[PDB]
Copies of this chain bind each other. A is one copy, B any other.
Amino acid sequence: MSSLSRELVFLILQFLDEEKFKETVHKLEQESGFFFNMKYFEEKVHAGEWDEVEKYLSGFTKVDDNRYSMKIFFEIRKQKYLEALDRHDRAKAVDILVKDLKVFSTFNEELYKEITQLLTLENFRENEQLSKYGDTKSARSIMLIELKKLIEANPLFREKLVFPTLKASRLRTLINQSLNWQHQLCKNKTLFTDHTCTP
């Protein structure tokens, strides 16, 4: 995965963006892990698509890579848990608590217990530290701000947050150059095979 190879991906990213292949752009972002699209991450957070959010994140970091990463996954999963409590889906809330939040219990036993106990409140805002929680829309925006600091501060996201300035259609431009080089033999088609000039 050399620097030239990695730069080819950015060129592909640009090309995909120009053809309006949106999902492909973000899958490529995620699977290559070369560029974290902060703007895309925001949209998905506001939309509360938490599965997509974590899946995208996993292209860049794991929960225990460092404490910035672990604080990021925690805030996401905490918000997910609270939203379930707020719609009174207790069953889903319990599922989130065992499947997503337990990994954090080893690191703070008392915090996990306190999180667990919110299940038995009729409204979780009765808890002092959550008392100022607004509605769903309000909580996501607030948490999004905290997610950004964590990401921007995170060592693993350092040089992945700004897309290089490029001239439009750069990949296409490189392809024209390669086509001209096949005509270098100039005695006067396709991209799949080299052009063969008739002599």
Q: Which of A5-13, A40-48, A154-162 lies at the binding interface?
A: A5-13
Tell me whether A133 is interfacial, beta carbon within 8 Å: no
Quickly give the copy total for this chain: 4
User: Which of A94, A172, A191 gathers most chain B CB within 10 Å?
Assistant: A191
Interface size class of A (residues with CB under 8 A): 35 or more
Query: Which residues A76-116 have CB closer than 8 A to chain B?
Result: 90-91, 93-95, 97-98, 102, 105, 112-113, 116
Tell me whether A15 is interfacial, beta carbon within 8 Å: yes
When each residue 5-27 of chain A gets 1 if its CB lies under 8 Å from chain B and 0 otherwise, what string results?
Answer: 10111111001100101111001
Tell me whether A130 is interfacial, beta carbon within 8 Å: no
Tell me whether A164 is interfacial, beta carbon within 8 Å: yes
Query: Which residues A152-195 have CB closer than 8 A to chain B?
Result: 164-167, 170-172, 174-175, 177-178, 180-182, 184, 189-193
Partner among B10, B12, B95, B189 whose Cβ is within 8 Å of the Cβ of A90? B95
